[PDB]
Symmetry: C3
Subunit: 339 residues, 3 copies
């Protein structure tokens, strides 16, 4: 399309929401291509990632870890206004894996504190894609400090299974998984720092061991458990988007399954079906579709159980509805062996 043609397309401004929720959108595209505008501010701030008060200097899109999920349709143009407040201390940029050219846009969006930039790119391929900060010479550091998220480019006709059957979800959740590398002092205790830059040297050496100290969903151990559990009802169809910008993960819905799973996260690649545990390589986003059939609590985890239960990669789903004894029943409840 020409500049004039693009300038004549209808525009739509979207207000982003904090994960795990997603901004309002329609699954089937309404009309022709549009220019969808999003705005994000970068915040460098301290966040507490566990119940022991462990602090990390996060670098976060819209102040959250992960950054928010953006949704557009294939062939729409995504126009992002990115702002780096004058009160931040580092240069930042953004690389969209969904985009084509200039290192995903990273080479055209380098902004120092006090600057802003506006990038537009055509969303040519459908699927869920990772986006993350990637400043020359400090790439992994900004990423493992939480500066990453994902976007979803829906086919204009919505989701379909491998044989054209339409798949409409009632709810959608976005789980961003993050590997953190927190330095410890000679006593085995987590160190604290004044400014982000003061934690750099120590962080890099932990990073080089390739072993994270924490692996969490939505920015903190237990961030998605208890009262903050994701919800659904028996019969509801749910789409769970999962991203990991730096490290492999293996999602699994304990008590459930992945009915249709785009493990590679790309919609033109037929989904795998009936999955127990799927795999998402570091630097990618994946999506799983599931229809709940039983009520109760479900654990959604990274299935390397040490990472899930010892490092923090575990979330909950609280589902309401009626129990189906055909699917599963306790014939004899736990009881003493009668001698």
């Amino acid at each position: 399309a020409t500049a004039a043609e693009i300038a004549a397309l209808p525009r739509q401004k979207v207000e982003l929401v904090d994960p795990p929720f997603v901004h309002a959108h329609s699954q089937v595209a309404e009309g022709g291509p549009k220019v969808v505008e999003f705005t994000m501010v970068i915040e460098e701030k301290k966040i507490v990632i566990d119940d022991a008060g462990t602090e990390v200097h996060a670098m976060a899109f819209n102040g959250t870890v992960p950054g928010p999920l953006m949704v557009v349709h294939q062939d729409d143009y995504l126009e992002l206004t990115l702002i780096n407040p004058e009160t931040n201390t580092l240069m930042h940029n953004i690389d969209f894996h969904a985009a084509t050219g200039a290192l995903g846009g990273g080479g055209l969006t380098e902004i120092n504190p006090g600057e802003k930039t506006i990038l537009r790119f055509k969303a040519t391929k459908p699927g869920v894609f990772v986006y993350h900060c990637a400043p020359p010479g400090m790439v992994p550091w900004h990423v493992v400090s939480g500066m990453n998220g994902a976007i979803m480019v829906l086919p204009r006709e919505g989701l379909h299974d491998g044989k054209g059957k339409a798949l409409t979800y009632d709810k959608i959740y976005y789980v961003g998984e993050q590997d953190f590398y927190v330095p410890r002092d000679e006593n085995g205790k987590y160190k604290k720092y004044e400014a982000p830059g003061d934690a750099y040297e120590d962080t890099v050496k932990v990073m080089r061991t390739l072993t994270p100290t924490h692996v969490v969903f939505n920015g903190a151990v237990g961030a998605l458990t208890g009262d903050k559990a994701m919800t659904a009802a028996v019969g509801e169809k749910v789409l769970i988007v999962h991203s990991q910008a730096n490290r492999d993960t293996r999602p699994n819905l304990i008590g459930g399954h992945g009915d249709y799973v785009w493990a590679t996260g790309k919609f033109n690649t037929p989904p795998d079906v009936d999955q127990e545990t799927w795999f998402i390589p570091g630097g990618a986003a994946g999506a799983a579709f599931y229809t709940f059939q039983q009520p109760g609590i479900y654990a959604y985890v990274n299935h390397n159980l040490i990472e899930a239960f010892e490092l923090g990669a575990a979330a909950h789903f609280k589902v309401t509805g009626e129990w189906n004894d055909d699917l599963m029943t306790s014939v004899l409840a736990p009881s003493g062996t009668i001698e």
Copy 2:
């Protein structure tokens, strides 16, 4: 189905066998749905995992690591009687990834020493699935102490390739891969303990490094080599089921291939073909079908060769038959360069 309908289905009691062998079963389902009954006892016992006398306090279904493979057909009901002897010391339960609801059955099967329980669930999805113990607050510990196995839910019509062609195996083997985390003393030697509970604190810290000390098949280094090598003959069709309840693995048949591989382990997902090395994420089971064409010894390994040859993840296949020179021949045997 209603309670009355399920109670009227024919019942079949199965006697489980120790891995790598599998209990007798038919590939094609005989008649209508049945209730298949299995019984497992939990044993907490010390096992020796290498040739240096390294001991670990195992927690094992039917006394083996991995637990035995259970086979049913899609839509059959699996009814398990699980027994925790009064002489054990910990609470245990079971979570079937093949099941739907109550954390895979884990929430309905918590039993203390001296108790038993009976769980029934409908095997609605075909494929190989992991099952493992998962007691609240001690999940990874029971799993990496060997309390896991797999089940296979065969399509009622048996296995088929991606285009409907039937695939009948002559033999089937089950290889359970286990990551162990054994604590070492200030001298670098493996520590020993009196009771399972006494090794907990030390084990957890090794677990947190995410680096296993041993990665073995069938419970011990060399468990499936030498005289205990799995066997086959040229022309025979073999199905190899492989599971890893906690950590990624990458199976490879050295000298052979994976003709048809359900790397995700789910039969409704077409298999990948002609594989050299396939990948099974932690928390999943996979299956590979191969027809031997050459006799001799084959090495079946986790292809991170350090894990295979240094940590223990290597097994053997001894195949009988006639050599095929068309497929491979030594034109000039190793010999001195004639100067």
Copy 3:
């Protein structure tokens, strides 16, 4: 085929070239099956892998790491002459994952310094496959010392996508990824050794931590950057073959995509499409096809960004051509917020 029939097939001698380039070949097979002859010499030599002068005693096919890529067509016979000079110190052999029998040929090609051997095998399955040294009792050590490469067995009719559409590449590059495990002294500095054998004991203990000190493409940090960047032009179709003989990797073309990706590396398995980051398990080779649409520099990396930017797994692509503003444009260049 019989011995006489094979002896009557036309023969073709190929001169191998150093990676990342590939020897001349035709994508579509010309005529009937042939016997393709290749010759490789093994060199045990010291190579420098980073800019800090870190030395490693490499074991390399034709003196390079990775060894060169060999290309044949399905059903061709590959006949390799392998030479171990009298000046080397260790026994070596070769295992082709593309071959069937005798541990990939490893059991028929064990040669001491001063010996040579000639092996022939039929290339029955199409796809890219790993090949590596694997001497009994020292398998992982020869592999992580760089003694591995890959071969490509093209379908006789050339590459096709999932629905029969032909895929012809203008250029092909071979990126061999290598995990190195270099021992450090009590001061944290990399140790040096006189002979390969003198570094063995120390290397094995680093290997057991399963954590590499370097992860590089084409044998050294920055080997494929700057003036040695791989090249292409907008509109050109490029095939990138990637192998890792021992450890998982997750390739990603920053700024681009994997239009068609055979992540398992086997051509009879339909490719995944529109990939951002793909996964290649250790012990396998994969291939990605991409048509450049934007000029500029692209980074081709292992997307665990710590491994890419801290350990060395990063290469460059320099692409010429005209910028496409429809695909991406800087609407507002980085500029100060006007207060």
